[PDB]
Design a protein around this ligand. Structure first.
Ligand code: GDP
Ligand code: GDP
Ligand code: GDP
Ligand code: GDP
Lengths: 431, 426, 431, 426
C-alpha cells in the first residue's frame, strides 16, 4: 500500500544504502538472491513497501543508485546482496564530481539528472500509493551533496505532496574529511531547508564516539557505522511494515515532529546498544531503553542536546511492551528534566510502539529528537564558511563551473537565518 | 570509468617512468611480457586506468615516451619491462637537448612536439572517459624542462578541463647537477604555474637524506630514489584503481588541495619507511603512519615545512584500517601542532582510505602537503637566477636559440610574484 | 525495597570490598558467575538490597569501584568473583595519587569524580527506595582518603537525607604504613566529621592483635583481616536482608548510636572468634557472645575502651536466640560495669536480633560501640600532625597541588575541636 | 596504566643499564631476541611499563642509550641482550667526554642533546600514561655527569610534573677512579639537587665491601656490582609491574620519602645477600630480612647511617609474607633503635609488599633510606672541591670550554647549603 522510493546518491550515501538493504532484506527474510525464505507471515504482508515482485517470487528492492563515478557502483554490484538490485536502476556517469558542489550540481549531475528522473518516474508509476521518497547522502561531498540536492529539487517540483526524507551525513566538528567541506555543507543546507519534509543529521564523529564509548569497539569499520545508520533507518519506517499497538507512518512523524516549516533537522538515536561482554549485566526493560534514548552521549549527531531545548521528540519503540510502562517513562522524563524541553509545547514526546522487534533483540526503540542544539552544527558550519569565503579560498573551483558568488552570499544568508530562527525559538518564554 | 595517459619526458623522466611502470605492473600482476598472472579480481577490475588491452590477452601501458636523444630510450627499451610498452610511443629526435631550455623548447622540442601530440591524441581517442594526464620530468635539464612545459601548454590548450598533473624533480639546495639549473628552473616554473593543475616537488637532496637517515642505505643508487618516487606516484592514484572505505580521485584531490589557482605546488611524502634492521623493532599502527607522515625529515622536497604553514593537506591511506583511528590521529595532529596551519582554513587535512595495501606491506599512507614553506625553494631559485642574469652568464646560449631578455625578465617577475603570494598567505 | 549503593575507593578499601562481596554472595547463594544456587527461600526474598537482576537470573552487585590506578582494578577483575561485577562500574584513572591527599582530592580525583558521580546517579536511578550509601576506604592513603572524602561531599550534596556510612581504616598507633599518614588522616577526618552519618574505625594493628591473640593465627594474611572486616560489614546490614525477632535498619542504628551530630565514630567488634583447636572447648551461649563482645582486646579499633565511657552501644545478634537471654546479658553488663557507661544516658545498649546466623555458625553477634576512648586515636593523630606540620614536613608536596596552608590549620583546629568535644562529654556529671 | 622511560648515559650508566635490562627481561620472561617465553600471566599483565610491543609478538625495551663515544655502545650492542634494544635509540657522538664536565655539558653534550631529546619525545609519545623517567649514570665521569644533568634539566623543563629518578654512582671515599672527581661531582650535584625528584646514592666502595664481607666473593668484577645495582633498580619499581598486598609506586615512594624538596638523596639497600656456603645455615624469615636491611654494613652508599639520623625510610618487600610480621618488625626497629630516627617524624618507615619474589628467591626486600648521614659524602666532596679549587688545579680544562669561576663558586655554595640543611635537620 504505502510505498517508499529509496534513492542512493554518492559514496557516503550509497555505501549506507547497501547496508540498509542488507538489513531490510534480513528483516523480511529475503536472501541475497531475491528469493523469500522467511518464517513469519507478517514478513510478506507489507513487503511491497520496499519491494517490487518480479514475476516468479523474486523480490526486487525499490531502490535507485546514483553516482558520477562507476567505482562505487562496481563495488555495490560485486558485494553481498548486490544481485538483488535491478540492473536498470544503476544510473552513473563517468567523470565524477571531485567533492565540488558546483560541478556535481550544475554540470555532471545536470547531465545525469534526466536519466535519474526517468528511473524515478518509472519506479513511481509502478507503485500502488506512493508514500514518499527516501534519500541517503552526505553533505560535505561531491555527487552526494550536489546531486542529492538537485534530485530533491526536481522531485519536489514533480511530486509536491509526497514525503521527502533524507538521511544526511553532516560535517564533523573536529576532523573534516574534505578540505572544501564548509562550502558543500552550506550550499547543501541552503538547498535542503527549502524542499525536504524532514532530514536526519548523522555525524561520523558521533558514530565513532558511540562505537568506542558504548559498543566498546577498538577496531570499528564503516560496516559498523553504516549498520548503526541502517538500524536507525529501519526503526524509522517500522510502523509502515509491521503491525503494532500504536502506528505512526512517515507523515505522522513529520506532523508531530516539525512545528515550523524550516525547523526539520533531527538528531536520531538508537537503543539498546551494549558491548559484547556487558550484555550479561544489563536487564532489558522499557526504563532502560528510555534512559539510553534520552542520553546526550548516545546521539548520532555530534551536537550536545543539553545545550538547547527539545521542540519535539519522537520515540518509536519495537517489540512486545506495556503501554503504561512507555507512557510512564516518557512522562517521567518530561517532568524530571523539564528544563530541557520547550516551554510553549506541552507533551513534547511522540510515542509509537510496534510489535516486531529487530533481528535478534527482544525489543528496541529509535530516538528522533528535534532539538534547538542543532544550531551548534549550523553556526559552526556558517563560521567555517565565512572564514573560508572571506579569503575566497578555493572559490575559483566553484565559480569556474558557472556558479555565481552572489549564490554563495545567498546561501550564507539562509544558513544564518536558520541559525537565528533556531536561537529565537529556544529560551523564548511561553508568556 | 576513469583513465589516465602517462607522459614521461627527459632522461630523469624516463628513468622515473620506467620504475613507475615496473611498480604499477607489479601491483596489477602484469609480467614483463604484458600477460596477466595476478591472483585477485580487483587487479583486473580497474586495470584500464593505465592499460590498454591489445586483443590477445595482453595489456599495454598507456604511456608515451618523449626525449630529444635516443640513448635513454634505448636503455629503457632494452631493460626489464622494456618490452611491455608500445613501440609506436617511443617518440624521439636525434639532436639532443644539451641542458638548454631555449633549445629544447623552441627548436628541437618544437620540431618534435607535432609527433608527440599526434601520439597523445591517438592515446586519448582510445579512452572511455579521460581523467587526466601525468607528466614525469625534471626541471633542471633541457628535454625535461622545455619539452615538458611545451607539451603541457599544448595539451592544456587542446584539453582545457582535464587534470594536468606533473611530478617535477626540482633543483637541490646544496649541489646542482647542471651549471645552468636556475635558468631552466625559472623558465619552467613560468609555464608550470600557468598551465598545470598540481605539481609535486621532488628533490634528490631530500631523497638522499631519506635513503641515508631513514632507510640506512649505504649505497643508494637512482634505482632506489626512483622507487620512492614511484611509490608516491602509485599512492597518489590508488583511489582510481582499487576500492576503499573513502575514495578520493585526482579531481577531488586537486579540489581539496589547491585553495588558489596559483598555489598548487606540493611536498609529497611516504610512510612507512624502515631499514631492514629496525623493521623488527617497530609496530606498524595508524598512529605510527601519522607520526612518520607529518615529519619534516620525511619530506621528499628539500624544504623544511616547519619554516612555513600548511594551506591544505592530503593523507591517502592504504590497507585495512579504522576510519575512527585515522580521523582521531588527524585531529590530534591539527590540535597539538596548530601553529603550523593557516588559521583561515578549518579542518586542513583531507583523508582517503583504500582497502588494498602496497605489495608486501600491511598498510601505508601517502602524504601530499601544500605548505607555504615551499617559498624557500622559489626564493633560492630566484636568488640564483638573479645572480646569474645580472652578469648575462650563459645567456647567449639561450638568446641564440630565439629567446630574448624580455622573456627572462617576465619569468623572473612571475617567480617573484609566486614567492610574494606564498609569503602573503603565511 | 531498602537498597544500598556500595562504593569502593582505594587499594585499602576496594581490597576489602572484594572480600565483602565474596562473603555477601556466599550468604545469598550466588556463585562466582552471578547465577543463584542457594537453598533457603529467604536468600532471594531481600536480594535487591545489594543486587540488581540482569534479565536472565544473573544478579549483579550494586557496587562501584573507584581508584586512580588500574592495577588494583585488574587484580579485582582477575580474582575470584571478579566476573560478577558490572564492567561499566570500574571507574579508574591512569596517574595515581601517590598517598598524597591534596593530589587525589584536588587534581586526579577531581578529574575522575564526574565519571564516578555519573555511575553513582545511574545506580541510584535503578533503585526502588534508596536507603543509603556505603563506602570502604582508608584514611592514611591517597585515592582512598581524598577520593572518598570528595565522593562523600558530592553525594551528601546531591542526596542530603540518605544514609552515608563509611568503613574507614584508621592509622595504627605503633606502625605507620605511610610516611605522610598524619596529614592524610587529619584532612580525611576534617572532611568526614562534616558529611557522614556514621563511620566505623577499623585499625589494622588491632586486627593483627585479634588474629594472633584470639584466632591463634601465626601467618595471618590480608585475606583474614579483610574477612573480619567483611564479617563486620555483613553483620551491620543483616537486619535489612533477613527477618528476625527485632529488626534494625541502618537508620535505626544511626538514631540509637549517634547522640550528637559530630560524635559518630564507632568501634566495631565481632563474636564468636575462636582458634581452630579451641572450638571443642567453648560452648556457644548468648552469655559467651556477650562476654566476648564487651572485651577491650576484641575491639577492631586500636583504642582501649576501658580508658573512656560508652555513649551508645549497638549489639546486633544473629541466629535463633532467646530474647530473655540477650536482654539479661545486656542488663547484667550495664549493671556490673556501670563505671564504663555514660551517666546521662540510661539504657546505653541497643539490641537487635536476626534469625539467620552467618555461614557455618549456629549464631553470632556484631558489636558497634560509640565510646569516648576514640579521643585517644584523634589526639594521637592530632599530635603527630602538629609535630610534622610545625616543621612543614612534606608540606610542599601538598601545597604544590594548589592546596592552602590555612586549610591545614583549619583541619587541625577541627580535629582538636572533635577531641575536646569527646573529652567534654565523658566524665561529665549527670547533675 | 603507568609506563617508564629508561635513559642510560655514560660508560658506567650503559653497563648498569645493560645489566638492568638483562634482569628485567629475565623477570618478564623475555629472551634475548625479544620473544616472550614466560610461564605466568602476571609477566605480561603489566609488561608495558618497560616494554613497547612492536607488532609481530616481539617486545622492545623503552630504553634510550646516550654516550659521547661509540665504544661502550658497541660493547653493549654486541653482548648478550644487545639485540633486544631498538637500533634507533643508540644516540651517540664521535668526540668523547674526556671526564670533563664542562666539555660534556656545554660542547659535546650540547651538540648531542637535540637528537637525544628527539628520541626521548618519540618514546614519550608512545605511552598511555607516562609515570616518569629513570636516569642511570655516574657522577665522576664526563658523559655521565654532564650529559645526564643536561638531559635532566631539559626533560624537567619539558615534563615538569613527571617523576625524575636518577641512580647515580657517587665518588668513593678511599680511591677515586678519576683525578677530577670533585669538580664533576660538585657540578653535577648543583643540578641534581635542583631538577631531580629522588636520587639513589650508589658507591663502588660499599659495593666491594658487600661483595667481600657478605657475598664472600674472591674475584668480584663489575658484572656483580652492576647486578646488585640492577637488583635494587628492579626492586624499586616492582609495585608498578606485579600485584601485591600493599602497593607503592614511584610517586607514592617519592611522597613518603622526601620531606623537604632538597633532601631527596637516598641510600639503597638489598636483602637477602648470602654466600653459597653460608646459604644452608640461614633461615629465611621476615625478621632476617628486617635485620639485614637496617644494617650499616649493608648500605650501598659508602656512608655509615649510624653517624646520622633517618628522616624517612622505605621498605619494599617482595614475596608471600604476612602484613602483621612486617609491621611488627618495623615497629620493633623503630622502638629499640629510636635514637637514629628524627623525633619530629612519627612512624618513619613506610612499607610495601609485593606478591612476586625475585627470580630464584622465596622472598626479598629493597631498602631505601633517607638518612642525614649522607651529609658525610657531601662534606668530603666539598672539602676535596675546595682543596682543588683554591689552587686552580685542572681548572683551565673547564674554563676553556665555556665555564667561569663564578659557576664553580655557585656550585660550591649550593653544595655547602645542602650540607648545612642536612646538618640542620640532624
Ligand atoms: N558513515 C559513513 N560515512 C562515510 C562513508 N563513506 C564516506 N563517508 C563520509 O562522507 C564524506 C565524503 O563524501 P563522499 O560521499 O565520499 O563524496 P561524494 O562521493 O562525492 O559524494 C566524508 O566526510 C566521510 O566521512 C561510509 O561508508 N559511512
Ligand atoms: N629522482 C631522479 N632524479 C634524476 C634521475 N636522473 C636525473 N635526475 C635529476 O635530474 C637532473 C638532470 O636533468 P635531466 O632530466 O637528466 O636532463 P634532461 O634529459 O634534459 O631532461 C639532475 O639534477 C638529477 O639530479 C633519476 O633517475 N631519478
Ligand atoms: N585491612 C587492610 N588494610 C589495608 C589493605 N591494603 C592496604 N591497607 C592499609 O591501607 C594503608 C595504605 O593506603 P592505600 O589505600 O593502600 O593507599 P591508596 O590506594 O592511595 O588509597 C596502609 O596503612 C595499609 O595498612 C588490605 O587489604 N586490608
Ligand atoms: N657500579 C658500576 N660503576 C662503574 C662501572 N663502570 C664505571 N663505574 C664507576 O664510574 C666512574 C667512572 O665514570 P664513567 O661513567 O665511566 O665516566 P663517563 O663515561 O664520562 O660517564 C668510576 O668511579 C667507576 O668506579 C660499572 O659498570 N658499574
Amino acid at each position: 500500500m504505502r510505498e517508499i522510493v529509496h534513492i542512493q546518491a554518492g559514496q557516503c550515501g550509497n555505501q549506507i544504502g547497501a547496508k540498509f538493504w542488507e538489513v531490510i532484506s534480513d528483516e523480511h527474510g529475503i536472501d541475497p538472491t531475491g528469493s523469500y525464505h522467511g518464517d513469519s507471515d507478517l514478513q510478506l504482508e507489507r513487503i511491497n513497501v520496499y519491494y517490487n515482485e518480479a514475476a516468479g517470487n523474486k523480490y526486487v528492492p525499490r531502490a535507485i543508485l546514483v553516482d558520477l563515478e562507476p567505482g562505487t557502483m562496481d563495488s555495490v554490484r560485486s558485494g553481498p546482496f548486490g544481485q538483488i538490485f535491478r540492473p536498470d536502476n544503476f544510473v552513473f556517469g563517468q567523470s565524477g564530481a571531485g567533492n565540488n558542489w558546483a560541478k556535481g550540481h550544475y554540470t555532471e549531475g545536470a547531465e545525469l539528472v534526466d536519466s535519474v528522473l526517468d528511473v524515478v518516474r518509472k519506479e513511481s508509476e509502478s507503485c500502488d500509493c506512493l508514500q514518499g521518497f527516501q534519500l541517503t547522502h552526505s553533505l560535505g561531498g561531491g555527487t552526494g551533496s550536489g546531486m542529492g540536492t538537485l534530485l530533491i529539487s526536481k522531485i519536489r517540483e514533480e511530486y509536491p505532496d509526497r514525503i521527502m526524507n533524507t538521511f544526511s551525513v553532516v560535517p564533523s566538528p573536529k576532523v573534516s574529511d574534505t578540505v572544501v567541506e564548509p562550502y558543500n555543507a552550506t550550499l547543501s543546507v541552503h538547498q535542503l531547508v527549502e524542499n525536504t519534509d524532514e532530514t536526519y543529521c548523522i555525524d561520523n564523529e558521533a558514530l565513532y564516539d558511540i562505537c568506542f564509548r558504548t559498543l566498546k569497539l577498538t577496531t570499528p569499520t564503516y560496516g559498523d557505522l553504516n549498520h548503526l545508520v541502517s538500524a536507525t533507518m529501519s526503526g524509522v519506517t517500522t510502523c509502515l511494515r509491521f503491525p503494532g499497538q500504536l502506528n505512526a507512518d512517515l507523515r505522522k512523524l513529520a506532523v508531530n515532529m516539525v512545528p515550523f516549516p524550516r525547523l526539520h533537522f533531527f538528531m536520531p538515536g538508537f537503543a539498546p546498544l551494549t558491548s559484547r561482554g556487558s550484555q550479561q549485566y544489563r536487564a532489558l526493560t522499557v526504563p532502560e531503553l528510555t534512559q539510553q534514548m534520552f542520553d546526550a552521549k548516545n546521539m548520532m549527531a555530534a551536537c550536545d542536546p543539553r545545550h538547547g531545548r527539545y521542540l519535539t521528540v519522537a520515540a518509536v519503540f519495537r517489540g512486545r511492551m506495556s503501554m503504561k510502562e512507555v507512557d510512564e517513562q516518557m512522562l517521567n522524563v518530561q517532568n524530571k528534566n523539564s528544563s530541557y524541553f520547550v516551554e510553549w509545547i506541552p507533551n513534547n514526546v511522540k510515542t509509537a510502539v510496534c510489535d516486531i522487534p529487530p533481528r535478534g533483540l527482544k525489543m528496541s526503540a529509535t530516538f528522533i529528537g528535534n532539538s534547538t542544539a542543532i544550531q551548534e552544527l549550523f553556526k559552526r558550519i556558517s563560521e567555517q564558511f565565512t572564514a573560508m569565503f572571506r579569503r575566497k579560498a578555493f572559490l575559483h573551483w566553484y565559480t569556474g563551473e558557472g556558479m555565481d558568488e552572489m549564490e554563495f552570499t545567498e546561501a550564507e544568508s539562509n544558513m544564518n537565518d536558520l541559525v537565528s530562527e533556531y536561537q529565537q525559538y529556544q529560551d523564548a518564554t511561553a508568556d
